[PDB]
Amino acid sequence: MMVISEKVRKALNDQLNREIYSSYLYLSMATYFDAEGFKGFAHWMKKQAQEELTHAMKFYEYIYERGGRVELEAIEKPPSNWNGIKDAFEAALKHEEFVTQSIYNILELASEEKDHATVSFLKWFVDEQVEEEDQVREILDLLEKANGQMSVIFQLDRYLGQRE
Amino acid sequence: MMVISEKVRKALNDQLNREIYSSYLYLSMATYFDAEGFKGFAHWMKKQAQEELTHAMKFYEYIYERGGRVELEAIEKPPSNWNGIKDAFEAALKHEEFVTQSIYNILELASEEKDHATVSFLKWFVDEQVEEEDQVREILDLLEKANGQMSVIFQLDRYLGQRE
Amino acid sequence: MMVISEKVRKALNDQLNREIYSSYLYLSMATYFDAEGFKGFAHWMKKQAQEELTHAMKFYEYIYERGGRVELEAIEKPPSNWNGIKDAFEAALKHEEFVTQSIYNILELASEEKDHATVSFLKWFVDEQVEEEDQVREILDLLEKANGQMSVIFQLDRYLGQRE
Amino acid sequence: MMVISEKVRKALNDQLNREIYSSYLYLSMATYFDAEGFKGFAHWMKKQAQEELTHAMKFYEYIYERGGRVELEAIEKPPSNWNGIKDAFEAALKHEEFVTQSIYNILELASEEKDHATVSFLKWFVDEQVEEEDQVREILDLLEKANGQMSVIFQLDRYLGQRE
Amino acid sequence: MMVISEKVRKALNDQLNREIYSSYLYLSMATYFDAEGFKGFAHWMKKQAQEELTHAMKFYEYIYERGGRVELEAIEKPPSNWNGIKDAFEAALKHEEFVTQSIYNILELASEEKDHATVSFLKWFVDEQVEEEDQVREILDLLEKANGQMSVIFQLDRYLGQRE
Amino acid sequence: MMVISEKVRKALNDQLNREIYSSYLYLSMATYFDAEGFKGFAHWMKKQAQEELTHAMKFYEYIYERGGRVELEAIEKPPSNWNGIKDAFEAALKHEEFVTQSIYNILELASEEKDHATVSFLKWFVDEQVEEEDQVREILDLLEKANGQMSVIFQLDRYLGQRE
Numbered sequence: 016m017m018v019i020s021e022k023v024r025k026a027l028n029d030q031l032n033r034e035i036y037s038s039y040l041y042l043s044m045a046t047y048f049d050a051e052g053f054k055g056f057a058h059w060m061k062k063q064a065q066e067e068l069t070h071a072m073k074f075y076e077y078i079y080e081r082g083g084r085v086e087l088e089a090i091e092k093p094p095s096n097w098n099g100i101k102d103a104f105e106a107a108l109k110h111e112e113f114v115t116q117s118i119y120n121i122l123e124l125a126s127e128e129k130d131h132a133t134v135s136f137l138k139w140f141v142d143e144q145v146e147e148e149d150q151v152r153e154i155l156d157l158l159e160k161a162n163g164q165m166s167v168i169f170q171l172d173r174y175l176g177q178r179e
Numbered sequence: 180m181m182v183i184s185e186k187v188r189k190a191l192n193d194q195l196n197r198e199i200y201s202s203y204l205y206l207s208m209a210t211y212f213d214a215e216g217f218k219g220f221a222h223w224m225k226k227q228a229q230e231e232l233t234h235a236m237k238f239y240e241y242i243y244e245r246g247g248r249v250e251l252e253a254i255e256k257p258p259s260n261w262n263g264i265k266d267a268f269e270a271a272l273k274h275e276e277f278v279t280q281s282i283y284n285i286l287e288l289a290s291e292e293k294d295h296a297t298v299s300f301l302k303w304f305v306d307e308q309v310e311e312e313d314q315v316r317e318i319l320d321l322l323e324k325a326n327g328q329m330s331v332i333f334q335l336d337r338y339l340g341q342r343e
Numbered sequence: 344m345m346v347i348s349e350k351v352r353k354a355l356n357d358q359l360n361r362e363i364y365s366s367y368l369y370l371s372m373a374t375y376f377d378a379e380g381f382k383g384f385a386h387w388m389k390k391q392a393q394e395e396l397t398h399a400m401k402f403y404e405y406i407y408e409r410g411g412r413v414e415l416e417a418i419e420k421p422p423s424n425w426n427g428i429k430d431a432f433e434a435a436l437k438h439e440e441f442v443t444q445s446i447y448n449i450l451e452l453a454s455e456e457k458d459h460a461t462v463s464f465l466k467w468f469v470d471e472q473v474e475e476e477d478q479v480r481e482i483l484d485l486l487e488k489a490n491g492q493m494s495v496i497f498q499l500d501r502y503l504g505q506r507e
Numbered sequence: 508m509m510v511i512s513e514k515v516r517k518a519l520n521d522q523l524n525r526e527i528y529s530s531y532l533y534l535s536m537a538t539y540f541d542a543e544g545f546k547g548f549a550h551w552m553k554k555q556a557q558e559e560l561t562h563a564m565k566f567y568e569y570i571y572e573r574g575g576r577v578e579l580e581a582i583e584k585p586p587s588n589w590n591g592i593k594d595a596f597e598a599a600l601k602h603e604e605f606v607t608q609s610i611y612n613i614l615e616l617a618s619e620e621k622d623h624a625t626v627s628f629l630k631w632f633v634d635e636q637v638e639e640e641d642q643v644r645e646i647l648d649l650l651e652k653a654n655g656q657m658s659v660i661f662q663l664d665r666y667l668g669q670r671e
Numbered sequence: 672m673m674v675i676s677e678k679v680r681k682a683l684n685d686q687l688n689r690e691i692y693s694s695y696l697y698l699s700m701a702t703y704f705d706a707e708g709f710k711g712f713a714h715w716m717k718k719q720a721q722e723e724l725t726h727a728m729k730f731y732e733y734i735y736e737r738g739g740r741v742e743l744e745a746i747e748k749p750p751s752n753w754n755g756i757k758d759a760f761e762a763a764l765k766h767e768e769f770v771t772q773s774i775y776n777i778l779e780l781a782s783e784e785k786d787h788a789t790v791s792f793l794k795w796f797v798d799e800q801v802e803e804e805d806q807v808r809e810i811l812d813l814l815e816k817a818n819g820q821m822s823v824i825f826q827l828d829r830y831l832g833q834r835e
Numbered sequence: 836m837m838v839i840s841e842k843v844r845k846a847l848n849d850q851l852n853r854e855i856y857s858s859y860l861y862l863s864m865a866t867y868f869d870a871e872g873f874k875g876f877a878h879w880m881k882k883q884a885q886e887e888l889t890h891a892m893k894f895y896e897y898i899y900e901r902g903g904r905v906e907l908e909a910i911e912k913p914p915s916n917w918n919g920i921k922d923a924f925e926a927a928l929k930h931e932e933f934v935t936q937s938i939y940n941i942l943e944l945a946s947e948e949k950d951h952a953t954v955s956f957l958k959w960f961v962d963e964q965v966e967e968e969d970q971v972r973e974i975l976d977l978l979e980k981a982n983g984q985m986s987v988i989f990q991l992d993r994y995l996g997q998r999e
């Protein structure tokens with residue numbers, strides 16, 4: 016028997032599909048950075064894409080743990096070009112903030128149905144999203160300071176290219 | 180400057196998106212096996228999905244290596260239900276034979292244009308596909324023998340669930 | 344279901360039996376050399392016989408990998424006697440060159456049928472044959488220098504006797 | 508000079524060719540098991556075939572050790588189809604019992620000629636045949652009990668596939 | 672006996688002499704960089720020159736393996752000067768692209784003769800050329816970004832000076 | 836600024852190109868020993884050829900150390916054929932004696948100019964030339980004791996083929 020409601024199960028399945036799209040968007044940003052010759056930023060984005068797949072799978076295993084099941088939906092075609100490095104990381108921040116709000120909406124839906132197990136499960140993602148948004152804000156800050164200077168950009172590209 | 184033809188880039192780009200679809204299909208098979216309580220079969224498919232990502236990224240990196248650019252496309256919704264374990268594995272075999280023909284068509288195209296670099300790059304996929312088809316054919320032959328006997332299926336689930 | 348044509352499977356199965364005979368021929372050479380007290384030339388021929396069996400088993404596993412089966416045929420009696428050291432090795436070389444041409448014929452047949460999997464599997468043997476032929480030519484060269492001087496042949500015997 | 512009679516030499520040379528045939532017979536049994544999809548039974552037979560070849564080379568070396576010469580004969584085409592698993596192993600047991608009687612005939616011939624060296628040398632094979640026949644009788648007993656039940660047959664396959 | 676045709680042996684020997692010139696051209700680029708004070712760039716070229724010698728020796732050993740003979744020809748004086756760092760690396764890329772087409776020409780010749788051993792042997796060079804051209808394309812892309820800014824040139828020089 | 840006289844720089848640059856020719860000559864000799872089936876002698880010459888390049892590069896580095904530049908010149912085609920093993924090594928010895936006298940001429944020139952730094956630099960090559968000459972003479976003496984006995988030639992081929 017499924018002990019999440021269908022409404023909560025749908026919200027969770029929807030978020031899992033959003034996490035898959037996040038992964039794909041970030042790979043698309045890698046394709047841009049690689050085309051522009053910034054292999055470090057592209058590497059950063061490939062690691063981020065893998066990271067989003069772990070989020071997808073966290074939702075996956077929770078849905079099954081609660082007796083639901085996962086239905087994978089079509090993945091929309093992501094954007095594949097940006098007006099520059101900053102424009103790309105700004106889109107990432109905007110995306111991550113939208114993901115944060117999507118998670119908040121599930122949390123409030125679970126709280127209104129008194130699904131305390133799902134409220135509690137989602138705490139992990141609330142905390143993770145703080146980290147996710149702020150790592151992008153940090154990079155955007157460095158790019159605002161570098162102000163186009165290839166000297167600095169080179170070293171940032173190499174720094175982010177070290178992400179484990 | 181791009182040293183692959185536009186027609187070969189498009190074939191390689193297309194195949195990269197087929198590898199992503201292949202990854203997603205196998206993840207959908209996992210959602211089905213998990214919904215049916217076969218955590219070992221599902222585990223096997225999750226590993227297969229990750230393996231297909233490695234194929235996509237081999238295409239990714241070769242395209243940039245030849246001066247091209249990757250464009251990510253929409254990913255179609257895969258089926259999410261099969262008529263039992265053997266049906267899912269028959270579909271998987273059919274999918275891998277389709278992938279193999281897709282790979283053959285690029286090789287032949289590349290050969291016709293005398294793109295020896297791409298013909299040689301594609302050898303690795305030719306040899307991998309043979310291994311991929313064989314792995315599924317072997318699982319199918321065992322399930323044909325088992326004739327749905329639950330004790331045989333349980334041992335096969337535990338074995339596939341140990342895949343690294 | 345078999346994914347090689349019957350024609351290609353027959354070609355491979357025929358070459359499998361050819362590798363078996365190659366093994367037996369070289370053992371027969373070991374019987375000649377062991378008879379003339381050359382225990383080192385005999386040791387080399389017994390190593391070559393064991394290597395031909397690895398060749399046969401490589402075709403074996405590929406045939407089954409592609410859904411065919413193997414049928415073992417009768418093995419013709421090999422020659423048991425040779426006019427001298429260099430008479431035997433020149434039969435070796437002529438045999439290995441016949442093997443190479445048989446391999447080439449399978450390659451061209453597969454290529455004509457667009458069986459890229461078999462064309463690629465055969466690359467391994469095309470490269471080994473280069474080595475198999477070269478090792479005999481080298482030995483014939485060392486013989487055509489020693490000019491029957493048992494002092495040198497005590498060393499040539501000694502050296503082939505060290506083959507691992 | 509030869510210090511075995513020609514009759515004892517012919518007896519030993521015949522037995523060497525018989526062990527070569529034994530090796531080929533078990534390899535044919537492997538082609539059957541693999542065709543039937545039992546890679547563990549097939550593995551056991553491949554290991555047997557390699558062992559039947561150590562037997563041949565022991566005769567080989569004794570013959571040269573007594574001043575005789577080996578001559579390799581044609582090898583007959585082995586059977587390639589059995590009715591089922593148990594029939595193949597039964598044919599294996601029948602073959603080993605025939606090999607045992609063949610060894611006995613040499614022993615009794617060497618004993619008549621007072622060739623005490625050959626008599627002593629053959630004790631190894633006598634004792635070894637006891638083990639070869641026993642190991643096949645054990646498998647047959649398990650297969651009799653399995654009574655065609657595929658759940659059990661699969662368990663035997665896996666076990667015999669671990670043979671070292 | 673030489674088992675390669677004279678036309679193929681000539682093409683191969685010609686390529687070998689082309690690899691020697693390649694080595695010498697990169698040494699000459701080293702002489703230019705060392706004169707301009709870029710020890711790191713010069714170091715990169717000195718390692719590249721040693722790498723071309725391994726290419727030459729690979730060709731050398733294959734020729735003798737197919738019963739042919741190597742004849743060393745005169746080496747042209749390479750250019751001694753370039754109009755800046757980018758100019759040198761553009762010359763390097765143009766040379767490696769010419770080397771790649773030279774190799775392609777041998778492969779198409781060997782394939783027309785059905786000289787499969789040589790077609791197969793040249794695969795290694797087809798794959799290596801992909802990397803040789805791409806490593807130079809990557810250097811040229813960073814140099815474009817640096818745009819003559821010495822603080823970035825120093826960064827690239829010390830990095831290329833790390834090449835092992 | 837250059838602190839060697841242009842005359843000394845031209846002599847050093849000339850010798851650098853002479854060491855490059857020496858490397859090429861010794862490789863040509865390897866082409867001859869390999870054509871003749873003496874792989875160990877061929878091996879010795881290949882090792883000598885690499886050693887020759889270290890000599891070249893010691894001149895290279897000293898020229899830049901004194902503020903000069905290197906200019907690479909064309910490399911003449913070497914001979915490829917000797918009348919026998921001893922003929923090749925006699926030619927090697929005569930070449931090295933020529934190199935020794937070329938080095939002496941540079942030392943005498945530098946001495947005439949009171950270029951004490953270059954005089955001292957060249958001491959290394961004076962001592963090394965004594966060795967390079969001695970090792971060819973040792974080999975010629977062993978060839979003379981061998982007196983065409985292929986027994987001994989084979990042992991020297993193998994010994995020289997062990998050179999590190």
Ligand SMILES: CCCCCCCCCCCCCCCCCCCC
Pocket residue numbers: 035038039042061062064065068072199202203206225226228229232236
């Ligand atoms: C070099 C690092 C490469 C990272 C590749 C990241 C790829 C993410 C692509 C997103 C596509 C999603 C659709 C397939 C999902 C498969 C999930 C398998 C998870 C077990």
Ligand SMILES: CCCCCCCCCCCCCCCCCCCC
Pocket residue numbers: 363366367370389390392393396400527530531534553554556557560564
């Ligand atoms: C050193 C002795 C080698 C003699 C070979 C003679 C060939 C006769 C053919 C007999 C069949 C032998 C079967 C070989 C089985 C190999 C199975 C290995 C598993 C990979």
Ligand SMILES: CCCCCCCCCCCCCCCCCCCC
Pocket residue numbers: 691694695698717718720721724728855858859862881882884885888889892
């Ligand atoms: C470590 C040395 C630094 C760079 C070496 C540069 C060589 C330039 C090209 C030389 C041309 C003459 C050919 C000599 C061939 C030597 C063969 C060696 C075989 C292992």
Ligand SMILES: [Mg+2]
Pocket residue numbers: 034037067070114
């Ligand atoms: Mg996420």
Ligand SMILES: [Mg+2]
Pocket residue numbers: 198201231234278
């Ligand atoms: Mg794939």
Ligand SMILES: [Mg+2]
Pocket residue numbers: 362365395398442
């Ligand atoms: Mg063979």
Ligand SMILES: [Mg+2]
Pocket residue numbers: 526529558559562606
């Ligand atoms: Mg036996």
Ligand SMILES: [Mg+2]
Pocket residue numbers: 690693723726770
């Ligand atoms: Mg090269």
Ligand SMILES: [Mg+2]
Pocket residue numbers: 854857887890934
């Ligand atoms: Mg020198």
